[PDB]
A paper describes a structure:
Multiple transcription factors can bind together to a regulatory element in a cooperative way, and cooperation between the pioneer transcription factors [name] (also known as [name]) and SOX2 is important for pluripotency and reprogramming. Here we present cryo-electron microscopy structures of human [name] bound to a nucleosome containing human LIN28B or [name] DNA sequences, both of which bear multiple binding sites for [name]. [name] has two DNA-binding domains: [name]-POUS and [name]-POUHD.
Both DNA-binding domains of [name] engage the [name] nucleosome; whereas [name]-POUHD is bound close to the nucleosome dyad, [name]-POUS is located distally from the nucleosome. Nevertheless, despite its distal position relative to the [name] nucleosome, [name]-POUS interacts with the [name] tail via a smaller acidic patch of [name] formed by the side chains of helices 4 and 5. We found that both H3K27ac and H3K27me3 modifications increased binding of the second and especially the third [name]. Of note, our data show that H3K27 modifications did not affect the binding of the first [name] to the LIN28B or [name] nucleosome, but it altered the cooperative binding of additional [name] or of SOX2 to nucleosomal internal sites.
Residue numbers in the entry:
A (entry chain H), B (entry chain D): 29 to 122
C (entry chain F): 21 to 101
D (entry chain B): 22 to 102
E (entry chain X): 140 to 220, 238 to 288
F (entry chain C), G (entry chain G): 11 to 118
H (entry chain E): 27 to 133
I (entry chain A): 38 to 134
Amino acid sequence: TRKESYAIYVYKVLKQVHPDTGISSKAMSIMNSFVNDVFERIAGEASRLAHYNKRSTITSREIQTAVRLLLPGELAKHAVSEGTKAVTKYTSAK
Amino acid sequence: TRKESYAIYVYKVLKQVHPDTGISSKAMSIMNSFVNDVFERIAGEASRLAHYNKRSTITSREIQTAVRLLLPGELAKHAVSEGTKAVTKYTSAK
Amino acid sequence: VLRDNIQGITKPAIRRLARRGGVKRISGLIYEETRGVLKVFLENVIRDAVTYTEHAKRKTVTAMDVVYALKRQGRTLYGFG
Amino acid sequence: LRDNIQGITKPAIRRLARRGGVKRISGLIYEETRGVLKVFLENVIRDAVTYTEHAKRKTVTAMDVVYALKRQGRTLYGFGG
Amino acid sequence: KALQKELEQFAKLLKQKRITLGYTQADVGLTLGVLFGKVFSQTTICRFEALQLSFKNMCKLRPLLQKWVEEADNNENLQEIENRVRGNLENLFLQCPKPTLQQISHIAQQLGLEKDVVRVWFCNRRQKGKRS
Amino acid sequence: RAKAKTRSSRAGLQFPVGRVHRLLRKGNYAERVGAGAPVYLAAVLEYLTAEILELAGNAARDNKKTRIIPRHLQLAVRNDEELNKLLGRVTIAQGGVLPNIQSVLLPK
Amino acid sequence: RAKAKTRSSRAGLQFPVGRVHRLLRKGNYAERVGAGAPVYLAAVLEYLTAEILELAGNAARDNKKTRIIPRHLQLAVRNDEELNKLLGRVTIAQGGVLPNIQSVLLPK
Amino acid sequence: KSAPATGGVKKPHRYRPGTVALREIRRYQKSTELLIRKLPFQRLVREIAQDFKTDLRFQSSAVMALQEASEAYLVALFEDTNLCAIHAKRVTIMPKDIQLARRIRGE
Amino acid sequence: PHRYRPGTVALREIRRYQKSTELLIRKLPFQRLVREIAQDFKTDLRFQSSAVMALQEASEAYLVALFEDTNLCAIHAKRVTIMPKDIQLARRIRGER
DNA sequence: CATATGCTAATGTGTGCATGTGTGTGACTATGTGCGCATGCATGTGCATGTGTGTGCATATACGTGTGTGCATGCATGTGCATATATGTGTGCACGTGTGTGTGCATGTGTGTGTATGTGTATATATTAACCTGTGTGCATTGTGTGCATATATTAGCATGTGTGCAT
DNA sequence: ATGCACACATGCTAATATATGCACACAATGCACACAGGTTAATATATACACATACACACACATGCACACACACGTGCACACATATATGCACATGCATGCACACACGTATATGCACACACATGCACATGCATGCGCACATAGTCACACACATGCACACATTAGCATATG
């Protein structure tokens, strides 16, 4: 059947940052592993944050707090900025 | 309000193993923390096991495999024996 | 609160901690080094605990915030909830 | 399959030490390294086989090994997880 | 400088203590030997008390005598308890001023003298002949 | 109807089977929870509690104490190989350390 | 209906917002997921991917390569302090190590 | 001059270096109480926290948990540091011992 | 006959193997070892080739990191040759004991 | 017998030459690097397609806001005394040096085992479809667990004896 | 072997932290009931294993030796120990605020379900970049030969101190 992965999105990002640079299949697998790992870490932290506060929904606030908990200083600041900007643009465009 | 803990059940277990031995409040708090920690570890491992195998139910099989993964050898064997015995008695009585 | 409270971790206290660790002889440069290490450790835990406190929209750091921060760092602590 | 630990030869252990930046190696290193690798492989393979049993399979997959490594705090990238 | 007069004063007082303690100069050398190990001959003590020795030697023997006079005052009882060879060697000179060790051994065996004694005497013969 | 009896008594356990089931259901672990899973988990938790409590009671008796304190729990955990492995990254408050002096530091 | 616009294009993102939302829903994290949570998470994942890919592309360009291989990802991660902290317990397959010889081992 | 010999011998005698250290090792490995004074540690915690949020409050049990964790961390680090010092055929722990222990631990 | 002094080609190999990324253990003996170890847990066990490759990658990464820590322990003791006690110390500090 | 002399064995201080050792500066030798040319497979582009996501209402409910309450935190005040600190001393530990040995490195050689290719078979993994049993939902019943008070046994604080180990 | 300092053992009081009890309320249980996830039987295919072959490179073994390490020794200074003084921690109260929690209402929002399309994935070539190989440049390593330094020994240059005999 169909095995979903992040390969096409990673390729789009790579073309955004390095239009003339390709990527090998093993490197693509490593990038897919990295995306899944970071997703699992952030989602687990946000789930625990919702549980600690007796909340049943995971919102962008929980994601922001999980990102701050899991990421080192400058990475956390820049990731929080990107997430906030994306959420603002999304709600501005419904 | 009411705060739930394992203190009374830990006390019953203590009275069975050591009928004439008490426990301090700090030691009871530590026992509560230990029970919660082991519960969270086992339940998280069982949840991951269910997700890996494309299942939506946590069954006693997932719990048994999580116990085998998380507990060291002899502890794991005795815990598996206790859990199997309890499930067998529960099914035979209901 | 105050300023420069790392000196409050005195040389005798560091010596007692080293004795509990089974250390027989301590060089004079250890204490300062120890202080730095402690500060780093605390800076990593408190920063996380406050983050938890900030998420709950509280102004008081609770024992549970510290416990969650310690668990987040792989240093789970029993006896405080 | 009997006594396959000696298949981890002296030159292979020396190459592994060179990648680790080691310049000089005592003659007793090789047996200790074989024991260390044997223990590591026991732990990982035991967890991977447990994952294989839970799936009711008879083939150890790459995902079983990846999950076993992740459970031990040794996350590996590049094999589907 | 004034070390000369300080040595002289010390030596006069040393003579006074030696005469007061009833010790002969040979006995002084014996005491120095049994308390330090470097026994000195009574000629050295004579030349000291008369201030005949050289300045470097003067300073060199100052400390030993200082220690002896500062220590012996406590208890005394336990502390108390050839020409033909010359002529032959001169005959051996006037022909070979600096003989080899091979000849030196023969000379030593001939006149019954120790090898080191003959060697040092040969060196001093050369020395006094090179004076002039 | 019939006189209600807890699932803990049905399973012959002291730990609360119903509470474990509720904690599994509301803990966001899976969409569904089987009937035998809370029983198995409660039995395992009770067994581990019993092991640690019996070792800690032995440690308290060795100290002529009738009440278990955090020191006894720490001694029981650290003196047991498998329990020490299970709680390797765990700090027990007011537990102290095992008495251990390296032989090189002992007097000659 | 109007023309169907993907939520990723609405949020200005390359990573799939809908897939992230579905994975959050079926991942057993909470019984409800907010509308902005998958958007925030997808944006964060895209940012981290972009950082790593930019560093790895620079590493590949340094080695006169047009294609990123695991070695370039390893060099990018380990040479960046923050990424190295984030991935400190992660092994990258076929990544090798960083060239490092202790100065005491060098000839004098 | 005067006379040699002379006493001056510092009669006062004491315990040998390391005997009291071993006694303190046994004493503090037997006990469980906190080895850092509570008030200075609380002041240090508040001063460190003031850099993250202004006008923070602390539960007493929060500071107690912080102190328990900090002392456990430091004692374990000192055990590792002692192992490193003994490895170098010494009995005195030095800052390089702490640095090596923290490097190996992954800190 | 030319002879390099001790430690020269050792440093050459350090540079060579820190420049490369290929597996350093032979694949077939490692596969035999993996199957031999897995026999003690099950009989008639089959392995995906990618599973054995993942095991080898993890094993070599673990051993290389251990050798780095062991080298640090050896240098700490003012030596340049790693010894079994260095490995034991590194594993004890790491908590792998 | 004990001092003063003349005199010369004996040692002691200094050059220094000559020899031996260690060092330093640049030919052979080996090895890693950098183009240059040719190949293969592996990456990237282009299509069917079917599955998952977007759209649209309709419903439920979780959470955010607002009010009121009581705990509990921070601050100030006061206390004795246990602890920290600065000082002086001496010891034994760390470090530096020197050395001898044997262990480990560099190298050469013969081989046998790993590697890559190729094949085929069976075993097992994955997929599909019917079904049925176990689990979620909802609601009434109520029995268990928790919070708030008592009552007490255990633990903590001293005072003398008791070995117990250290150090001269 | 004896003296001294320290941790422990028996014993007695005192309190505070634990064990037990009673009331209420909330979550566990019991009972239908619906439904979908999981089970099971059959089947199609993927792929792992087992064998077979040739080849060549890496491994194993033996050799020669260099330098790293373990041991020994000397030393100086850094740190342990003891002491006298003073600081500030611990305790203990008491007060006021402020903030964390409870509770309730009511809406914004997440879910649910059905449909429709377009996005992502499997499959298919196409080509071009990474790899492989032979040549040549190109960096570094290691004697080599020499040069400089340092020892020592040893020769030779001064001082030194004891003998035989002279005084006395």
